[PDB]
């Protein structure tokens, strides 16, 4: 009994750690993540959002699964509503009556995209900052004193900006303030797309910098890829996006035959509907013969690359599964009339 | 009646006696306006805590200060604690900053600012209580210049572009610019080597369509006493030390320029007496009483004084100022105390 519950306890870590990585494109020291996993509390990890405009399915659904994932493994989450990082990126013009109107947009798609939100929390970066602005701002500040200019000047991917462009201070203090969040928010594990690893690369040199020896696990998810060969408006499905946008959207996506890479379609497959699954029926045509069910995902690179997948039956798989997954956000945004003209009013505004 | 003509009489008074602070005021038509709006001017200048302080944030301020408060301005003192902290003085140590700061209020309440017209701020501790103002200012001003623009402000921390540049050098006059904002400051009265962030605070009014726009009202630089603790005089220094570090001291005959002897009479000395009397014996000139600071010149220049006079009365002229300020940290024990911990610092 007393070696037995050891092993056991090895072996629940183990399978905890395996399928955390799962969604995981890149993890920065795997090592450190089971370390972590062996604290006898919960590990918090979070996410940030720019307030600018319609939600990326990214945002939403993929998401919502990676979310479910780490709470049913001891994580709790927040979603971390970057309104003031917004504005300093020039969104919406700026405008933080509008910011604040998306950020509420945002909480409502969530708030009905499948998650649990028992171990989940929906934080704005505006009202925690000035809960503690001595803490907070501190942070920035000494963050700034420990990088130069130019090693801050490579984490202008995290938002969307380059060096091509004119750098404007807000780059600088940009990344200053996203790097102070992930200590402020006692982050374990940042869980963020791999466009952000260079600001989450720069907390854990300040940790060694200053010799914090709890440093911040970084789990970046894929980038899904625009629907377009080699990835505007007809880029990506959205959130708000209807059953006959979907269609249309996927229906002209690259979807080469017999090839799985750089292939938007299959992504969506792997990334969004078979996790939300745990499986993938084929449906096919009325007779040809179809209906097939797979199972893991293994299987389904084989067959692709066998031929047995045509493209129009992959597409209409997918886009009919990205329709049945979106129903309960559009079901939400037709009866809750309250949140029905919330989306009505934030669709009038002009993106930046 | 003739009531009116004594009204500009009022108003041209107060504008000569502020415009003579600067050699540059920034736009004297709008000091004009200015008072004509309001008597009350709010003016401000601000101090990193990183040590033992320099003369001029203490004799000569005080000359600026009373000069401006005496015509109805109220001037703050910022003690830019965070700013020493950022900048890396005191090892960063904010506990030793906060320590400095409350040294330099002893220091300025017993060298003529103990006023009602004075006040003292400490940056922490006002930002701390309207922090989204000031930081949702310090934010857009970093929206509105790029990286190359506000490098140029580099002078206001005492740094240079070849050296490491970290992004503390980036914040930091960004940070300076919102307190012009933030403490609606009408006139700022900083030296001239924090004026480029001055300039920025106007160039910010101009872009945000902001129409009341700050004065820039910068004193000259006093020269340094060389060609480290020896290169100025500070305000703690006893008798012995003034005397060695003017005899050591950079004077160069006929020469005023960059002459930091000459600076200390004509910028600390002859405004604090209206006068400036040289003593020398006989066969050296004699005695000689100055009245003005152009005949004080032309003796200079010309060779009727002599540098060994020069800092002789000068070292003596200084040492007569810093005496309310000595008795005040030999007297009073409290103060005593503090100067004694702030001594055993280590600068950095
Ligand atoms: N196609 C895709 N596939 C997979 N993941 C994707 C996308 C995608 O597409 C996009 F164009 F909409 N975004 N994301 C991911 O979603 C999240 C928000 O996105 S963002 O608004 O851009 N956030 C920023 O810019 C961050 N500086 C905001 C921020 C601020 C302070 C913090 O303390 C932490 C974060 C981030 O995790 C992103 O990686
Ligand atoms: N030799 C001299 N002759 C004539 N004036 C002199 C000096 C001298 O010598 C020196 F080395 F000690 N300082 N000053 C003047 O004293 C004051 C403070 O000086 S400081 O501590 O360096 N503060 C800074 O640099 C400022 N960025 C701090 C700051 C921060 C936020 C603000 O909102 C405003 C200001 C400023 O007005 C300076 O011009
Ligand atoms: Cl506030
Ligand atoms: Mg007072
Ligand atoms: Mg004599």
């Excluded at 200053?210 to 377009?228: T, Y």
Aim: with cysteine; proline share 3%; charged share 30%.
């Amino acid at each position: 009994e007393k070696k037995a519950q050891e092993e056991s306890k090895i072996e629940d870590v183990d399978k905890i750690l395996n399928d955390i990585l799962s969604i995981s494109s890149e993890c920065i020291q795997p090592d450190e993540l089971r370390v972590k996993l062996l604290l006898k509390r919960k590990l918090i990890c979070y996410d940030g959002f720019e307030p600018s405009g319609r939600m990326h399915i990214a945002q939403g659904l993929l998401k919502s699964i990676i979310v479910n994932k780490l709470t049913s493994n001891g994580c709790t989450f927040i979603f971390w509503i970057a309104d003031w990082f917004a504005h300093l990126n020039n969104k919406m013009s700026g405008d933080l009556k509008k910011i604040k109107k998306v950020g509420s947009y945002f909480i409502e798609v969530w708030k009905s995209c499948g998650m649990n939100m028992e171990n989940v929390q929906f934080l704005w970066a505006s009202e925690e900052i000035n809960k503690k602005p001595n803490e907070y701002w501190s942070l920035v500040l000494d963050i700034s004193r420990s990088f130069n200019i130019n090693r801050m000047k490579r984490c202008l991917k995290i938002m969307g900006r380059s060096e091509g462009e004119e750098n404007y201070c807000s780059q600088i203090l940009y990344p200053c303030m996203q790097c102070a969040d992930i200590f402020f928010l006692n982050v374990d594990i940042c869980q963020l797309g791999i466009d952000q690893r260079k600001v989450n690369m720069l907390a854990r040199e300040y940790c060694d910098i200053k010799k914090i020896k709890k440093k911040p696990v970084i789990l970046c998810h894929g980038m899904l890829p625009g629907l377009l060969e080699g990835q505007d408006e007809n880029s990506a499905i959205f959130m708000d996006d209807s059953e006959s946008d979907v269609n249309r959207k996927i229906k002209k996506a690259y979807c080469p035959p017999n090839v799985i890479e750089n292939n938007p379609i299959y992504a969506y497959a792997k990334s969004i509907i078979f996790p939300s699954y745990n499986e993938f029926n084929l449906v096919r045509k009325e007779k040809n013969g179809g209906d097939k069910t797979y199972y893991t995902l293994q299987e389904l690179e084989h067959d692709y690359v066998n031929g047995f997948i045509h493209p129009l039956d992959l597409k209409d798989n997918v886009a009919m599964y990205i329709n049945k997954l979106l129903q309960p956000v559009r079901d939400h945004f037709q009866n809750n009339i309250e949140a029905k003209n919330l989306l009505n009013e934030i669709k009038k505004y002009k993106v930046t």
